[PDB]
Structure formats: C-alpha cells, structure tokens
Short mmCIF file of C-alpha atoms and ligand atoms in Angstrom, two decimals:
data_model
loop_
_atom_site.label_atom_id
_atom_site.label_comp_id
_atom_site.label_asym_id
_atom_site.label_seq_id
_atom_site.Cartn_x
_atom_site.Cartn_y
_atom_site.Cartn_z
CA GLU A 1 -218.92 -25.09 -41.72
CA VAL A 2 -218.53 -24.35 -45.37
CA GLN A 3 -221.71 -23.06 -46.96
CA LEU A 4 -222.60 -21.63 -50.37
CA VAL A 5 -226.18 -20.45 -50.29
CA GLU A 6 -227.88 -19.51 -53.57
CA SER A 7 -230.96 -17.40 -54.20
CA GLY A 8 -232.65 -15.42 -57.01
CA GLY A 9 -233.68 -18.22 -59.39
CA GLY A 10 -237.10 -19.55 -60.21
CA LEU A 11 -239.67 -18.97 -62.92
CA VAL A 12 -239.02 -16.21 -65.46
CA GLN A 13 -240.72 -15.17 -68.69
CA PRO A 14 -238.80 -15.60 -71.97
CA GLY A 15 -236.96 -12.39 -72.73
CA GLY A 16 -236.76 -11.60 -69.03
CA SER A 17 -233.93 -11.43 -66.55
CA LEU A 18 -232.84 -12.89 -63.22
CA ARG A 19 -230.19 -11.97 -60.64
CA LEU A 20 -228.57 -14.99 -58.98
CA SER A 21 -226.76 -14.61 -55.69
CA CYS A 22 -224.40 -16.99 -53.85
CA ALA A 23 -223.39 -16.21 -50.26
CA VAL A 24 -220.25 -18.06 -49.21
CA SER A 25 -218.91 -18.80 -45.75
CA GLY A 26 -216.36 -21.02 -44.06
CA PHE A 27 -213.31 -20.49 -46.32
CA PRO A 28 -211.51 -17.37 -47.77
CA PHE A 29 -213.80 -16.62 -50.69
CA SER A 30 -211.80 -13.57 -51.79
CA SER A 31 -208.72 -15.73 -52.45
CA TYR A 32 -210.38 -17.93 -55.12
CA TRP A 33 -211.57 -17.74 -58.68
CA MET A 34 -215.29 -18.57 -58.79
CA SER A 35 -217.58 -19.93 -61.48
CA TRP A 36 -221.16 -20.55 -62.44
CA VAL A 37 -222.10 -24.00 -63.83
CA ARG A 38 -225.52 -25.02 -65.10
CA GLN A 39 -227.32 -28.28 -65.81
CA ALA A 40 -230.33 -28.51 -68.07
CA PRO A 41 -232.95 -31.08 -66.92
CA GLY A 42 -231.59 -34.57 -67.63
CA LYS A 43 -228.33 -33.25 -69.10
CA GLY A 44 -224.68 -32.82 -68.13
CA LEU A 45 -222.83 -30.07 -66.34
CA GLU A 46 -221.95 -27.01 -68.46
CA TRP A 47 -219.48 -24.37 -67.31
CA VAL A 48 -220.99 -20.87 -67.90
CA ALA A 49 -218.58 -18.19 -66.58
CA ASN A 50 -215.72 -17.54 -64.18
CA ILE A 51 -214.18 -14.56 -62.38
CA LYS A 52 -210.78 -13.76 -60.87
CA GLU A 53 -210.28 -13.18 -57.13
CA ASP A 54 -210.49 -9.40 -57.52
CA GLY A 55 -213.07 -9.35 -60.32
CA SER A 56 -210.57 -8.00 -62.87
CA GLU A 57 -210.75 -10.90 -65.37
CA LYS A 58 -213.72 -13.00 -66.35
CA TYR A 59 -214.68 -15.43 -69.09
CA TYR A 60 -217.97 -16.65 -70.57
CA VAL A 61 -219.26 -19.42 -72.77
CA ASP A 62 -220.10 -18.08 -76.25
CA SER A 63 -223.85 -18.65 -75.90
CA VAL A 64 -224.09 -16.25 -72.94
CA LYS A 65 -221.39 -13.68 -73.78
CA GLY A 66 -222.83 -10.18 -73.76
CA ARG A 67 -226.04 -11.09 -71.90
CA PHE A 68 -224.81 -12.76 -68.69
CA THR A 69 -222.49 -10.90 -66.32
CA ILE A 70 -220.53 -12.55 -63.52
CA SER A 71 -219.52 -10.30 -60.58
CA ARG A 72 -218.56 -10.60 -56.94
CA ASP A 73 -218.77 -8.63 -53.72
CA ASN A 74 -215.77 -9.75 -51.66
CA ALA A 75 -216.86 -7.58 -48.72
CA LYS A 76 -220.08 -9.67 -48.56
CA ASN A 77 -218.35 -12.95 -49.56
CA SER A 78 -220.87 -13.17 -52.41
CA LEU A 79 -220.95 -14.16 -56.08
CA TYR A 80 -223.55 -13.03 -58.61
CA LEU A 81 -224.82 -13.88 -62.09
CA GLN A 82 -226.92 -11.27 -63.87
CA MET A 83 -228.82 -13.07 -66.62
CA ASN A 84 -230.64 -11.22 -69.44
CA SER A 85 -232.58 -12.03 -72.61
CA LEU A 86 -233.51 -15.40 -71.20
CA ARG A 87 -234.60 -18.25 -73.48
CA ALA A 88 -235.84 -21.80 -73.04
CA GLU A 89 -232.24 -22.93 -73.76
CA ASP A 90 -231.27 -21.32 -70.44
CA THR A 91 -233.62 -23.45 -68.32
CA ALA A 92 -231.33 -25.27 -65.90
CA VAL A 93 -230.17 -25.61 -62.32
CA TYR A 94 -227.45 -23.01 -61.79
CA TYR A 95 -224.62 -23.71 -59.31
CA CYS A 96 -221.97 -21.42 -57.94
CA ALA A 97 -218.71 -23.36 -57.98
CA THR A 98 -215.38 -22.62 -56.33
CA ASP A 99 -212.01 -23.11 -58.08
CA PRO A 100 -211.23 -26.81 -57.42
CA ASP A 101 -207.89 -25.83 -55.92
CA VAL A 102 -209.86 -24.95 -52.78
CA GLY A 103 -209.70 -28.67 -52.14
CA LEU A 104 -213.05 -28.86 -50.31
CA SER A 105 -215.68 -31.37 -51.37
CA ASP A 106 -218.62 -29.16 -50.39
CA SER A 107 -217.44 -26.18 -52.48
CA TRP A 108 -220.55 -25.64 -54.65
CA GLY A 109 -223.88 -24.06 -53.85
CA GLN A 110 -227.14 -26.00 -53.43
CA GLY A 111 -228.36 -24.96 -56.89
CA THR A 112 -231.26 -22.80 -58.03
CA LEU A 113 -233.63 -23.91 -60.79
CA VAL A 114 -234.23 -21.32 -63.46
CA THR A 115 -237.34 -22.14 -65.51
CA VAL A 116 -237.84 -19.97 -68.59
CA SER A 117 -241.58 -20.15 -69.32
CA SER A 118 -244.60 -17.87 -69.87
CA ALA A 119 -246.77 -20.03 -67.56
CA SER A 120 -248.00 -19.07 -64.08
CA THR A 121 -246.95 -20.69 -60.86
CA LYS A 122 -249.54 -23.26 -59.81
CA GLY A 123 -249.63 -25.10 -56.52
CA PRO A 124 -250.27 -28.84 -56.23
CA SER A 125 -253.36 -30.81 -55.35
CA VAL A 126 -252.42 -33.49 -52.82
CA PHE A 127 -254.40 -36.72 -52.81
CA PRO A 128 -254.03 -39.78 -50.52
CA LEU A 129 -252.72 -43.14 -51.74
CA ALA A 130 -254.31 -45.83 -49.53
CA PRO A 131 -254.57 -49.46 -50.84
CA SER A 132 -257.80 -51.42 -50.28
CA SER A 133 -257.82 -53.75 -47.27
CA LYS A 134 -258.71 -56.56 -49.68
CA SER A 135 -255.59 -55.78 -51.76
CA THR A 136 -253.22 -55.43 -48.71
CA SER A 137 -251.99 -58.96 -48.27
CA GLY A 138 -249.04 -59.27 -45.86
CA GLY A 139 -247.25 -57.51 -42.97
CA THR A 140 -245.88 -54.46 -44.71
CA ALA A 141 -248.25 -51.86 -46.03
CA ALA A 142 -247.67 -49.11 -48.53
CA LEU A 143 -249.29 -45.69 -48.43
CA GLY A 144 -248.53 -42.40 -50.08
CA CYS A 145 -249.50 -39.04 -51.47
CA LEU A 146 -250.06 -38.05 -55.05
CA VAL A 147 -248.82 -34.51 -55.63
CA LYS A 148 -250.55 -33.47 -58.83
CA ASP A 149 -250.74 -30.54 -61.21
CA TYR A 150 -248.08 -28.06 -60.08
CA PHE A 151 -245.64 -25.78 -61.85
CA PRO A 152 -242.71 -25.11 -61.90
CA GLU A 153 -240.54 -27.63 -60.13
CA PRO A 154 -239.62 -28.30 -57.39
CA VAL A 155 -241.75 -29.66 -54.58
CA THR A 156 -240.50 -31.20 -51.37
CA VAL A 157 -242.24 -34.04 -49.57
CA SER A 158 -241.62 -35.20 -46.04
CA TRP A 159 -243.47 -37.69 -43.84
CA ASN A 160 -244.53 -37.00 -40.25
CA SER A 161 -242.57 -33.73 -40.32
CA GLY A 162 -239.30 -35.53 -41.14
CA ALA A 163 -239.74 -38.18 -38.40
CA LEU A 164 -240.40 -40.90 -40.99
CA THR A 165 -237.59 -41.46 -43.49
CA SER A 166 -237.04 -45.24 -43.60
CA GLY A 167 -238.93 -46.83 -46.50
CA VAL A 168 -239.80 -43.49 -48.16
CA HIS A 169 -239.63 -43.27 -51.96
CA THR A 170 -240.34 -39.87 -53.46
CA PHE A 171 -240.37 -40.36 -57.20
CA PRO A 172 -239.00 -37.98 -59.84
CA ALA A 173 -241.71 -35.72 -61.18
CA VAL A 174 -243.19 -36.39 -64.59
CA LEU A 175 -244.33 -33.63 -66.91
CA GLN A 176 -247.90 -34.31 -67.99
CA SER A 177 -249.40 -33.35 -71.38
CA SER A 178 -251.03 -30.39 -69.60
CA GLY A 179 -247.57 -28.90 -68.95
CA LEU A 180 -247.98 -29.44 -65.20
CA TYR A 181 -245.91 -31.83 -63.09
CA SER A 182 -247.07 -34.78 -61.01
CA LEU A 183 -245.15 -36.83 -58.46
CA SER A 184 -245.98 -39.55 -55.95
CA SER A 185 -244.32 -40.15 -52.62
CA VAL A 186 -244.82 -43.52 -50.97
CA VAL A 187 -243.69 -45.16 -47.77
CA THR A 188 -243.78 -48.79 -46.70
CA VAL A 189 -244.67 -49.43 -43.09
CA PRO A 190 -245.63 -52.34 -40.82
CA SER A 191 -249.33 -53.30 -41.25
CA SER A 192 -249.38 -53.65 -37.47
CA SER A 193 -248.87 -49.85 -37.31
CA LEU A 194 -251.81 -48.82 -39.51
CA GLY A 195 -254.18 -48.76 -36.53
CA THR A 196 -252.07 -46.80 -34.03
CA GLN A 197 -249.88 -44.49 -36.08
CA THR A 198 -250.89 -41.48 -38.15
CA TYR A 199 -249.20 -40.88 -41.49
CA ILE A 200 -249.15 -37.32 -42.84
CA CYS A 201 -247.35 -36.18 -45.95
CA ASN A 202 -246.00 -32.64 -45.79
CA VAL A 203 -245.85 -31.04 -49.23
CA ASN A 204 -244.13 -27.69 -49.88
CA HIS A 205 -244.26 -25.94 -53.25
CA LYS A 206 -242.17 -22.87 -52.60
CA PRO A 207 -242.76 -21.30 -56.06
CA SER A 208 -246.49 -20.80 -55.36
CA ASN A 209 -246.10 -20.46 -51.56
CA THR A 210 -248.25 -23.59 -51.17
CA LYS A 211 -247.90 -25.90 -48.17
CA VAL A 212 -250.29 -28.83 -47.79
CA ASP A 213 -250.37 -31.48 -45.07
CA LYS A 214 -252.48 -34.53 -45.95
CA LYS A 215 -253.46 -37.25 -43.51
CA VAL A 216 -253.50 -40.64 -45.24
CA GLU A 217 -256.20 -42.82 -43.65
CA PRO A 218 -255.92 -46.61 -44.15
CA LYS A 219 -258.76 -48.73 -45.52
CA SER A 220 -260.33 -51.62 -43.58
CA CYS A 221 -263.15 -54.10 -44.30
CA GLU B 1 -212.00 -25.10 -76.33
CA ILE B 2 -210.48 -28.18 -74.74
CA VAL B 3 -212.97 -30.98 -75.28
CA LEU B 4 -213.09 -33.67 -72.64
CA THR B 5 -214.50 -37.05 -73.61
CA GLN B 6 -215.38 -39.54 -70.88
CA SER B 7 -215.56 -43.32 -71.27
CA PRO B 8 -217.46 -45.47 -70.70
CA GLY B 9 -220.81 -43.70 -70.81
CA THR B 10 -222.25 -46.19 -68.33
CA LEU B 11 -220.43 -48.54 -65.95
CA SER B 12 -222.19 -51.21 -63.90
CA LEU B 13 -220.15 -53.00 -61.20
CA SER B 14 -220.65 -54.84 -57.90
CA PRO B 15 -219.49 -53.91 -54.38
CA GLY B 16 -215.84 -54.82 -53.93
CA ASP B 17 -215.08 -54.30 -57.59
CA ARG B 18 -212.52 -51.81 -58.93
CA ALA B 19 -214.18 -49.08 -61.02
CA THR B 20 -212.18 -47.14 -63.64
CA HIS B 21 -213.47 -43.91 -65.22
CA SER B 22 -211.51 -42.44 -68.15
CA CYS B 23 -211.28 -38.82 -69.31
CA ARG B 24 -209.53 -37.91 -72.56
CA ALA B 25 -208.62 -34.36 -73.54
CA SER B 26 -208.38 -32.93 -77.06
CA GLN B 27 -205.18 -31.14 -76.08
CA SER B 28 -202.74 -31.53 -73.20
CA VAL B 29 -203.94 -30.41 -69.76
CA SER B 30 -201.48 -29.80 -66.92
CA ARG B 31 -202.06 -32.12 -63.96
CA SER B 32 -202.59 -29.04 -61.83
CA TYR B 33 -205.84 -28.35 -63.65
CA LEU B 34 -207.94 -31.53 -63.85
CA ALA B 35 -210.80 -32.15 -61.40
CA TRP B 36 -213.34 -34.90 -60.78
CA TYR B 37 -216.81 -34.51 -59.30
CA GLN B 38 -219.42 -36.94 -58.01
CA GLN B 39 -223.08 -36.00 -58.64
CA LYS B 40 -225.92 -37.93 -57.03
CA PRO B 41 -229.41 -37.54 -58.54
CA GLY B 42 -230.97 -34.18 -57.93
CA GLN B 43 -228.00 -33.16 -55.74
CA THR B 44 -225.19 -30.64 -55.95
CA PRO B 45 -221.94 -32.06 -57.41
CA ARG B 46 -219.23 -32.65 -54.84
CA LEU B 47 -215.53 -32.13 -55.63
CA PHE B 48 -213.69 -35.42 -55.21
CA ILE B 49 -210.28 -34.91 -56.90
CA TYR B 50 -208.40 -31.74 -57.72
CA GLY B 51 -205.05 -31.26 -59.46
CA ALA B 52 -205.53 -34.68 -61.14
CA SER B 53 -204.55 -36.71 -58.07
CA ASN B 54 -205.41 -34.88 -54.82
CA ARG B 55 -208.37 -35.97 -52.72
CA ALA B 56 -210.67 -33.20 -51.52
CA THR B 57 -211.65 -32.96 -47.91
CA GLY B 58 -213.76 -35.80 -46.63
CA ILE B 59 -213.15 -38.04 -49.58
CA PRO B 60 -212.46 -41.70 -48.66
CA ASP B 61 -209.19 -43.39 -49.54
CA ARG B 62 -210.90 -45.75 -52.04
CA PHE B 63 -211.22 -42.80 -54.46
CA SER B 64 -208.08 -41.79 -56.36
CA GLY B 65 -207.16 -39.92 -59.49
CA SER B 66 -204.25 -40.16 -61.88
CA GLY B 67 -202.95 -39.24 -65.31
CA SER B 68 -201.35 -36.43 -67.25
CA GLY B 69 -201.38 -34.97 -70.75
CA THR B 70 -204.46 -36.16 -72.55
CA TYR B 71 -205.46 -39.17 -70.44
CA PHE B 72 -206.85 -39.14 -66.89
CA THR B 73 -208.65 -41.65 -64.66
CA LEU B 74 -210.77 -41.70 -61.54
CA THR B 75 -210.59 -45.01 -59.71
CA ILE B 76 -212.75 -46.46 -56.99
CA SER B 77 -210.50 -49.22 -55.65
CA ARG B 78 -213.22 -51.16 -53.82
CA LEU B 79 -216.77 -50.12 -54.70
CA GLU B 80 -219.39 -49.51 -52.05
CA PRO B 81 -223.17 -49.40 -52.70
CA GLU B 82 -223.28 -45.71 -51.82
CA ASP B 83 -220.91 -44.91 -54.72
CA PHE B 84 -223.52 -44.82 -57.50
CA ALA B 85 -223.42 -41.44 -59.21
CA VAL B 86 -222.51 -39.64 -62.37
CA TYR B 87 -218.80 -38.80 -62.28
CA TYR B 88 -217.60 -35.80 -64.29
CA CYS B 89 -214.12 -34.60 -65.16
CA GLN B 90 -213.36 -30.93 -65.71
CA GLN B 91 -210.33 -28.98 -66.87
CA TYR B 92 -209.68 -25.59 -65.32
CA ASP B 93 -206.45 -24.63 -67.14
CA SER B 94 -208.03 -22.30 -69.66
CA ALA B 95 -211.54 -21.01 -70.23
CA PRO B 96 -213.97 -22.37 -71.04
CA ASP B 97 -213.37 -24.66 -68.05
CA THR B 98 -215.09 -27.56 -69.75
CA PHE B 99 -216.64 -30.66 -68.25
CA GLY B 100 -216.70 -34.07 -69.77
CA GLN B 101 -220.12 -35.56 -70.48
CA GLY B 102 -220.07 -37.82 -67.40
CA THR B 103 -219.84 -41.56 -66.70
CA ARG B 104 -222.89 -43.03 -64.93
CA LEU B 105 -221.79 -45.62 -62.36
CA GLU B 106 -224.52 -48.07 -61.37
CA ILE B 107 -224.18 -50.70 -58.67
CA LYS B 108 -224.89 -54.31 -59.57
CA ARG B 109 -226.58 -56.63 -57.11
CA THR B 110 -228.30 -60.00 -57.19
CA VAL B 111 -231.73 -60.24 -58.75
CA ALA B 112 -234.60 -58.96 -56.60
CA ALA B 113 -238.26 -59.21 -57.61
CA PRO B 114 -240.63 -56.27 -57.00
CA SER B 115 -243.37 -56.21 -54.42
CA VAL B 116 -246.44 -54.81 -56.16
CA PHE B 117 -249.08 -52.50 -54.70
CA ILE B 118 -252.05 -50.76 -56.30
CA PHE B 119 -253.86 -47.60 -55.18
CA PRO B 120 -257.30 -46.55 -56.41
CA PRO B 121 -258.18 -42.89 -57.02
CA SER B 122 -259.24 -40.95 -53.94
CA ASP B 123 -262.79 -39.70 -53.62
CA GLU B 124 -261.21 -36.25 -53.18
CA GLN B 125 -259.67 -36.47 -56.66
CA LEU B 126 -262.81 -37.82 -58.34
CA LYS B 127 -264.58 -34.60 -57.42
CA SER B 128 -262.26 -32.84 -59.92
CA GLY B 129 -263.16 -34.94 -63.01
CA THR B 130 -259.89 -36.94 -63.28
CA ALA B 131 -258.94 -40.32 -61.80
CA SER B 132 -255.34 -41.38 -61.18
CA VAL B 133 -254.62 -45.07 -60.50
CA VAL B 134 -251.14 -45.82 -59.17
CA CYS B 135 -249.14 -49.04 -59.32
CA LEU B 136 -246.00 -49.31 -57.17
CA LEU B 137 -243.17 -51.78 -57.87
CA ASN B 138 -241.08 -51.72 -54.71
CA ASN B 139 -237.46 -52.67 -54.09
CA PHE B 140 -236.38 -54.59 -57.17
CA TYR B 141 -233.28 -55.16 -59.34
CA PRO B 142 -232.42 -54.85 -62.25
CA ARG B 143 -234.12 -51.61 -63.31
CA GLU B 144 -235.80 -53.05 -66.40
CA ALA B 145 -239.48 -53.82 -65.76
CA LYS B 146 -242.59 -54.00 -67.89
CA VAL B 147 -245.84 -52.58 -66.48
CA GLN B 148 -249.14 -53.08 -68.30
CA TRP B 149 -252.46 -51.61 -67.33
CA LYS B 150 -255.74 -53.37 -67.99
CA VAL B 151 -259.24 -51.98 -67.40
CA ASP B 152 -261.98 -54.65 -67.50
CA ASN B 153 -259.30 -56.82 -69.09
CA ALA B 154 -258.63 -54.29 -71.91
CA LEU B 155 -254.96 -53.36 -72.38
CA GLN B 156 -254.35 -49.63 -72.02
CA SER B 157 -251.98 -47.64 -74.19
CA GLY B 158 -250.88 -44.00 -74.16
CA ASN B 159 -252.49 -43.06 -70.79
CA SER B 160 -249.74 -43.99 -68.31
CA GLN B 161 -246.46 -42.49 -67.13
CA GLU B 162 -243.66 -44.08 -65.11
CA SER B 163 -240.77 -42.88 -63.02
CA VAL B 164 -238.07 -44.65 -61.08
CA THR B 165 -236.21 -43.82 -57.88
CA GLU B 166 -232.43 -43.69 -57.62
CA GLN B 167 -230.74 -46.81 -56.36
CA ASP B 168 -231.01 -47.45 -52.62
CA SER B 169 -227.72 -46.43 -50.97
CA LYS B 170 -227.55 -49.62 -48.87
CA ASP B 171 -229.13 -52.40 -50.94
CA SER B 172 -228.95 -51.06 -54.54
CA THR B 173 -232.62 -51.70 -55.39
CA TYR B 174 -235.01 -49.48 -57.38
CA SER B 175 -238.67 -48.65 -57.01
CA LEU B 176 -241.02 -47.61 -59.80
CA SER B 177 -244.37 -45.84 -59.98
CA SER B 178 -246.78 -46.18 -62.88
CA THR B 179 -249.73 -43.79 -62.98
CA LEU B 180 -252.79 -44.43 -65.19
CA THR B 181 -254.80 -41.28 -65.88
CA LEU B 182 -258.50 -41.65 -66.81
CA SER B 183 -261.49 -39.31 -66.86
CA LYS B 184 -263.82 -39.77 -63.87
CA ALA B 185 -266.51 -40.82 -66.33
CA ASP B 186 -264.25 -43.60 -67.72
CA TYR B 187 -263.26 -44.76 -64.23
CA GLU B 188 -266.89 -45.03 -63.09
CA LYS B 189 -267.88 -46.97 -66.24
CA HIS B 190 -265.50 -49.87 -65.43
CA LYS B 191 -264.94 -52.29 -62.56
CA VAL B 192 -261.59 -54.12 -62.71
CA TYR B 193 -258.30 -52.19 -62.54
CA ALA B 194 -255.14 -54.26 -62.98
CA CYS B 195 -251.43 -53.65 -63.26
CA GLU B 196 -249.42 -56.56 -64.65
CA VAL B 197 -245.70 -56.64 -63.93
CA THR B 198 -243.02 -58.56 -65.85
CA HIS B 199 -239.55 -58.65 -64.29
CA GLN B 200 -236.65 -61.09 -64.39
CA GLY B 201 -236.84 -61.68 -60.63
CA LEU B 202 -240.33 -63.10 -60.98
CA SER B 203 -240.93 -66.69 -61.99
CA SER B 204 -244.07 -65.53 -63.84
CA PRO B 205 -245.69 -62.12 -64.32
CA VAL B 206 -247.69 -60.74 -61.41
CA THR B 207 -251.04 -58.99 -61.66
CA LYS B 208 -252.28 -56.73 -58.87
CA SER B 209 -255.90 -55.63 -59.18
CA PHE B 210 -258.85 -54.09 -57.40
CA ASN B 211 -262.55 -53.73 -58.05
CA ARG B 212 -263.76 -50.14 -57.91
CA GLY B 213 -265.52 -49.61 -54.55
CA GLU B 214 -263.97 -52.53 -52.61
CA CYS B 215 -262.94 -52.20 -48.96
NA1 LIG C 301 -222.33 -23.33 -75.43
#
C-alpha cells in the first residue's frame, strides 16, 4: 500500500521551531519531486516548498524563504521540513505532497497540525449528553458526549471502541472565548436499545496524552 | 507567480447532474502541469487529475479533466452524493506551484426538516461552576437554520455557539449543534430551558424544552 506518514508537528511557542518528517512507502520516492503544502484553519491550500529527486534544487514561497528548509533522505524514503522563527501566520495543517505525475490518488501525507501559541496543552473534560425521559418522545434516541475545554486541536471521538459508527455526528470544534476548544459528539440509536446496550464515548487528546472513556447513562422516569 | 483563479466559488447541484469546475491561469500552463485535487472536510486532499486530463489511480470514470493554455475544467459527468468536497486546481510547471482558491461543491437534495433534541447539563459539569445546555438539530436540508435559546421565556443573546457537520455521504443532510453556556448560578436560578428552531422544512417553528430537574 502507498503510505505517507507525517510526524513532528503540534504546539510550538512563537519564535520557536519544529522539524516535520514524512515517511513514504509503496512507490519509488527517490524518483519524484516532493513538496510541502499547508492549510490555515478554514482557508485554502498553499504550496510552501518543493525539492528535486536528488535534493539539488529546491524552491520556497517568499514568506518562508530563509527560515524553512526542505530536505530529503532517499535512503530512508523520507521528506523533511525544518521550520524556524515560527509565527501565528504559520499555524496550519502541513502536508507532504508528491509530484502529481506520480498519478496516485493517495499521494499526500495525513497532515500534521502546527499550532503557534504560547499556551499550554490542556486535556478535555468529558461530560455525558443524556436527554430527559420526559423529553425523549419517539423510537430513536440521541445521546452524546461534550468534550470541553481542551487545547490545542485535535481530539478524536469514537463510540463503543469503533463498533458504533452509524448515526454518529462528531461536530467541528468551536473556539470559546477562553481560548479553549469544545466539541460535542452525538449518536442516534433505537430507544429500544437504551435498556440493554451500553454507550461509551472514547475521547483521545494526543497533545496532552489524555484519554477518557465516558459511559453515557440514559434517563428514565 | 502564476495565479490560478477558480470559478464558481460555490456550486450546488443534485445527484445525476453534470458539475463543471473552471480554473483560469494568469499565464499559459502546459497541459503536462495542471492537477486537480478533491478535499473532504478535515481530510487530506486526494489527487484526482494530473497532466490536465489523466485520472489518478482509483478515480472513477465520472471524473474528467480538460483544457490547455489559460483555461482548464474538472467535470463530474453524473454527480453522486459522495462527491461533495472542495476541488482545487494546481499548476506544477514553475515554482511557486500555486493552487487555485478552490470551488466548494455541495449536493442538493429535497427539503428535510430537523429532528430536535435537547440535553441538560450533567451533574458532573455543574460541580465545576459552568453549565452547558445543548440543542441538536439532526438530519436536515438545506443548511440554513435559525436556533434561538430562551431561559424562562427570555431570549438569550451572545452566550451560544453553533457548529455543523459535513453533508452525509449517502443522503446529503446536515446536523447542527447549538451550545448555550451559563454560569451554574444562572442555571440554578431558572426553570425552563428552550431551543426554538426555524427551518424551511418545518411547517412552523419547533420548540424543544425541559424543566431543570425533570426525569
Ligand atoms: Na505567501
């Protein structure tokens, strides 16, 4: 299988630096030009830099020239971006991206979010969302988890350890006035199930090494 | 730099329809160096077309690309509900290997009213001094919806936030969460918590409410 696996991103103080890595497999990496592309939250794709097969030529967008360096290690099938003098303007998901002439749809990495901020990592509080019995009126019941007060993005939410996917809606996070994120994840389920099936949300906030599993207990009169 | 300008900014079409995405370049680009990508929300872009007109691996036959010079298109010949995305063009002739600004393709469907649910704050949360009340609008279309919070029949302003899911890949509906944030003190001072929903699929606005403490 083709894979481009990124690491090295995350939270970083303004003025600081990060080293992004991208480990490629499943096609002849050393035969292609490679690039980095970034996407600020809510914005479009922006090409950042590229590099020739053998590393001997490379180009940069003006706003990063002199402070970002693209490099590659063909022996390790890996691409790198060394990023210095970071600013809020650099906050973005960063993708490694193969020359399109590779002709493979899955030719970019999974992305790594770089958040340029002086704030600390903070793990979420996870609270149950259970509607009152009196307010549950017909056949399909909603429940959820509120994932509150974390930083930076992202969090992942699953239900019943990935067993429950139908009817799940994990909302985009919202930034609160506090500067911390909040998200809800809900699932709709048959009312008939509420008695005989447990519903647990599994929340992972990798930036703070926080994992929480919360059992959501239904309400009855 | 070569500037790429995409049109339209937003395109909303039904399954079966032919979708056309345009990409104009400020100077001529060789066919060999124009790509198109599909990006789903929160996901890595996928390469769909390379060299102006070649399909990447795994790309269905309903996607095609064409053009030369300063005008290029991506076509979806027969739209499917899973095709919602932002589509970007990119030139890779000369650095910077610029992207266009994207065309957002949304899938049209027939009108669908939301189902509305309301969740009180948990006792766990109240221990911390804040109360979050959540209103869910589930599986509706179109996206536009008005949500109003009332507390003991008083309209709230400035203390709620909303977010919306991506379109469902099969049935093209949205869901929306609205969260009202109050102090614990404020929550415990009042009884009736209501979210009122206005949406074109409804015959009349719907209010979902609870009384604090009810089973
Ligand atoms: Na720039």
